[PDB]
């Protein structure tokens, strides 16, 4: 069902896309997985610990 959802929109069904370097403009081999993950921010700041 995830692959079928990736086929409705124009997106690669494999899930892994091919990225380029940002400092050298080169192409990385072994195309990597790129997506959207939901990250959280814990209440452990460096200002309250230094």
């Amino acid at each position: 069902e995830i692959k079928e959802l990736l086929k409705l929109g124009d997106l690669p069904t494999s899930g892994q896309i091919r990225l380029y370097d940002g400092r050298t403009g080169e192409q990385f081999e072994r195309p990597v997985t790129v997506g959207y993950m939901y990250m959280l921010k814990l209440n452990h700041l460096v200002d309250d610990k230094m």
């Binding site: 959802l5 997985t33 997506g35 959207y36 939901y38």
Partner: protein, 50 residues
């Protein structure tokens, strides 16, 4: 936005962050096809079908 370490996945077996990454990219692709139909004028008839 985020560059995670891929070698942390096989050590601690948490595959849920791999399917969520694929499913999160899929959910964004359905949000880009609608944003395209909303950035430019499109009848509600086309939006009710997709």
């Amino acid at each position: 936005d985020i560059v995670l370490n891929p070698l942390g996945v096989p050590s601690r077996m948490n595959i849920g962050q791999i399917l969520e990454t694929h499913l999160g990219m899929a959910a964004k692709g359905i949000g880009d096809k609608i944003n395209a139909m909303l950035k430019q004028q499109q009848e509600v008839a086309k939006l009710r079908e997709f």
